[PDB]
């Protein structure tokens, strides 16, 4: 009889004490602000239509974030752009921005002997 | 669940396992790490495009027929034909399989966005803004990068299209 | 609290944490056994007038009968009641496909020779318990009789 | 000045996993593994050798498996660090000691420079890149027909501002007059498709006439 | 990055022959790249200097 991972979705404790519980895999009928995600029943999060960027992963496209209450949403992949393609049309940059971007790479781990 | 695997519902077996200590947690922890790494791997391949570019409806790509690799408009999943071909061709004991973060439709959206950008704007949507370029001129500059002077495309464009259309 | 407890930390960073595994624990206990009304005991096995000699051990199939083993184990007669693969306290919770009862007599200090995997005159030349024996060995003094 | 306001998690995971691995290896010394005590001095005060040996063998078994787990975890995670180190060495070579034509190998946009900076157990690359900005739409053509011969851009793209035609470099709008210096000829102009008509300028033609 | 979002001068990184374009396609647990490449054909011998 049914079992699953009790996953606590939390903001930082610095931000808030409220948390939501994802009961992985189980359907909400068997669990006992209740939402049947395709990852499992999520208790204590509010379903919202607005597809924000993914803050905390849940699964199957649902993510959760704090907005104060925990909200759960199907994440957005980005804004939508037809580029106005036409067989006679070129776009050319008239200016530029020098951006300096930071890429951080591991190079070592601590040397240990036991 | 290391306890469900080793024991099932058996309080005495579960208690004996506590004497072996953190080994039950180390496995849950290591598999959690592998699991989050899979979403990271998928994101770093497909989320290279920050903006879901769309194709125009008029597919006037200079004779090149992308119909097998662009999305099918008749389908809810928005796979291409070659994606649909690929996705066709290729319990209780405490194990569980977790759903990926990005659904197959989200990977199709990203794959569509990378392809739409590529055919409508070339490299530019990668290197910044998706500056559109007519596809024949994009191919002519791709030719210029392989050391073949760009007239060799325009003077052979119907052949180059027919070779590409056949190869797809 | 479960998150704080599983991270071994009094503070938690933003995330999703697999704090616990739930299971819809069983509401009630069923018991089901065959509706066998026969009680036919080991009585004629324990209390026979003469037993077999050890070389020709008398074997009786106790079968298709209920057997309370507590009324055996409570008998103060049984100086040895060594069991293997099953424990006396639980025998009444089990049911068995067949229960062969093998009965014979041997000199007192030689009783210790009977146990599975032992060797010597009984175990070598008269009656050998297999190393994967599941069963109980019952022995009691009979100088008063034999 | 913006780097002050801004990936360290991918590096802190190294510090945090080595810490958690050692901490877990120390905590497993408290584990009994079926022995009557976790501390061997208990076994050896409580019991004499013939009984202690079985107790010690349980502790040895569980401690040796704890330590083989650690060393297996570290060997795996060291292979991951060496992948990151070889990538960092390649970035040092190709982004710092060079300029890279490899798209997104040295940050977003077209790579100019990279500067290395030391970090704890890591390297930080400040990739300086050219990101093009302020797009304008222009009408474009693959070739100009002049006097029946097809002119193509020698290095660039033909653009029209509606009225005129110009050559520009592709990645920045500097409009230049279409000339036999800025264009090259291949074939008669019937074979190309999408062609347009505009008067290419020969610098010799005015200069010779100015004699 | 190098075959879709770019064009690669790296021999064999984006198929056999000189790389033109690559198109990404999704697959189960994977990505399929359709590398479009220019392969030269119909050699003729010439004297050179
Ligand atoms: C390429 O052009 C489109 C269309 O812009 C219109 O046509 C131009 C020739 C010019 O007359 C514009 O003023 C027209 O609006 C561009 O889309 C426009 O983008 C601006 C923002 O820059 C926006 O305010 C307008 O609403 C857009 N117009 C339409 C009809 O959608 C497009 O940005 C250009 N493509 C690229 C890659 O730069
Ligand atoms: C190119 O873009 C830059 C950045 O936006 C422009 O520089 C700014 O110009 C405004 C006036 O229009 C000034 O107030 C800012 O101080 C400038 N910024 C810097 C960093 O100097 C520049 O004018 C643009 N050039 C063209 C030709 O469009
Ligand atoms: C691109 O190629 C496809 C595949 O050959 C063409 O689509 C086919 O067209 C015929 C004729 O109308 C139909 O009978 C097929 O059913 C179509 N196949 C599919 C999968 O739709 C398409 O016409 C080509 N593009 C152009 C512009 O001609
Ligand atoms: C280059 O090779 C190609 C491929 O063999 C030739 O293309 C074919 O040309 C014939 C006419 O000669 C057409 O009927 C075919 O349709 C062409 N193929 C395709 C895929 O369209 C081409 O002729 C050759 N060109 C030269 C100059 O040798
Ligand atoms: C063998 O005979 C004896 C004596 O008749 C039986 O003794 C009984 O044993 C049970 C179980 O220990 C006791 O509860 C009774 O009080 C005993 N009765 C007497 C009068 O002592 C014994 O039951 C017989 N053996 C078996 C296996 O039934
Ligand atoms: C296209 O660009 C050309 C060159 O800058 C423009 O032509 C100039 O226009 C000004 C008046 O606006 C005249 O004083 C110049 O003599 C013209 N130069 C030449 C070489 O003809 C033209 O106006 C631009 N057209 C648009 C629509 O922007
Ligand atoms: C581009 O220029 C060519 C050459 O001047 C034009 O072709 C001529 O067009 C006239 C008018 O139709 C004909 O009388 C000539 O016989 C054509 N010459 C040739 C060699 O074909 C062409 O029409 C122009 N195209 C555009 C769009 O302006
Ligand atoms: C905790 O909250 C305070 C505000 O009360 C904030 O200034 C601080 O940065 C927070 N710390 C962390 C680690 O988030
Ligand atoms: C549980 O819910 C899902 C939809 O969220 C449904 O597909 C499934 O049939 C339900 N029942 C079981 C046993 O999974
Ligand atoms: C989300 O969308 C559904 C329709 O698909 C709508 O019924 C629901 O009210 C929306 N949720 C909120 C919080 O508005
Ligand atoms: C562009 O497409 C239109 C159809 O929409 C066609 O009539 C025209 O000839 C094409 N021009 C070029 C330069 O490809």
Residue numbers in the entry:
A (entry chain B): 590 to 621, 641 to 675, 690 to 736
B (entry chain C): 737 to 826, 854 to 931
C (entry chain B): 297 to 442
D (entry chain B): 932 to 937, 944 to 1148
E (entry chain C): 1030 to 1078
Mind quoting what the paper says about this structure?
S glycoprotein trimers protrude out from the viral membrane and are the major proteins on the viral surface, making it the main target for vaccine design.
Alpha and Mu have a P681H mutation (681PRRAR685 to 681HRRAR685) at the furin cleavage site, while Delta has a P681R mutation, making the furin cleavage site 681RRRAR685. The efficiency of furin-mediated processing can be ordered: P681R (Delta) > P681H (Alpha and Mu) > P681 (B.1 and Gamma), in broad agreement with other studies using authentic live virus particles and viruses generated using reverse genetics. Delta (34 ± 14) and Mu (35 ± 16) had more prefusion S trimers per virion than B.1 (20 ± 10); Alpha (23 ± 12) and Gamma (27 ± 13) had similar numbers of prefusion S trimers as B.1. Taking the virion diameter into account, the density of S trimers (per 1000 nm2 surface area) in Gamma (1.5 ± 0.6), Delta (1.9 ± 0.9), and Mu (1.9 ± 0.7) is higher than in B.1. The majority of S trimers from all strains have all three RBDs in the closed state (hereafter, closed state), ranging from 73% (Mu) to 88% (Delta); the Mu variant has the most populated 1-RBD open state (hereafter, open state), constituting 25%. The D950N mutation induces a structural difference between Delta/Mu (which both contain the D950N mutation) and B.1, indicated by >2 Å Cα RMSD. When aligning the HR1 residues, the position of loop 940–945 in Delta and Mu (N950) differs to B.1 and there is a change in the rotamer conformation of K947; these changes are not observed for Alpha and Gamma (D950). The fusion core at residues 936–945 in HR1 has been reported to be critical for the conformational change when S transitions from prefusion to postfusion and we speculate that the D950N mutation may modulate this transition.
